[PDB]
Amino acid sequence: KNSYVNKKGKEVLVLWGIHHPPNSKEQQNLYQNENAYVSVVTSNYNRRFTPEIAERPKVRDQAGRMNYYWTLLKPGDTIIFEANGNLIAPMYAFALRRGFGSGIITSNA
Amino acid sequence: SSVSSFERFEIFPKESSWPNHNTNGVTAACSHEGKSSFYRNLLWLTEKEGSYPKLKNSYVNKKGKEVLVLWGIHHPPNSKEQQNLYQNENAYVSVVTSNYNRRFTPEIAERPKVRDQAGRMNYYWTLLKPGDTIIFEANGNLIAPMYAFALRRGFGSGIITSNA
């Protein structure tokens, strides 16, 4: 269990992953607990995650899956990461400055 | 926004619907008159004689029109409070109708205190059709209805935000 408080005064965008092994033996040699979990929570966020161990097609030569999540952490809001396996914890997060006239375009110029 | 009116009728009577569960669960977050109080349309069900037997209580929509039912599901900050209020760490709720079917499970984990409460309270709803039954089955963490609302659909209605 690890915690961060938003001391930036700006919307901290946190990204984390939840891994899903293709087999139960890999779950037991990377994370020890077969019935592992993760539980990322804030003041208004609350979600538990659980690895769905199952045999799947290889993509980038990987039968495993890797579910990427996010939430906005408000000014002064605390986030509490908790787990006993499969949590791919953030190194870095991004304190956003809102601004208008921005937007995504697809250009070959 | 598409309703003109409804009636506030007691869908599950506080005393008779729960002979095996203490219904007078009350919180400082829902305080009123300065003392701790609770929702006039919900019951916080807890242990009675230090036990929470598996409840199974049912209502049928005999109002002949869309009954909006409201219920909460509690999620403790710790496994001590999960035991002390609900007896079962393997606690669940299951609210089911003709076209509705949903099971709930307490996501127990420590969280940032809001309104001076580390616990969470997830408010769910469903429309109960004319003549349709709703069945509440649980062994913990069900915050059962007291009251529900038989709708009367309106036109020209809508929600506005006005300081006038």
Curated annotation (Swiss-Prot), chain B:
Instruction: Give the glycosylated residues.
Output: 163
* Protein name (Swiss-Prot/TrEMBL): Hemagglutinin HA1 chain
- Please name the gene that encodes this protein: HA
